[PDB]
Amino acid sequence: XXGXXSAXFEVXA
Incomplete structure (x- = not known):
């Protein structure tokens, strides 16, 4: 992660 939800x-593949 490390994106913050x-x-x-x-977002994609």
């Missing part, structure tokens, strides 16, 4: 910043 899903906030639409780096």
Whole structure:
């Protein structure tokens, strides 16, 4: 992780 939950910043594959 290390993104801070899903906030639409780096989602895909």
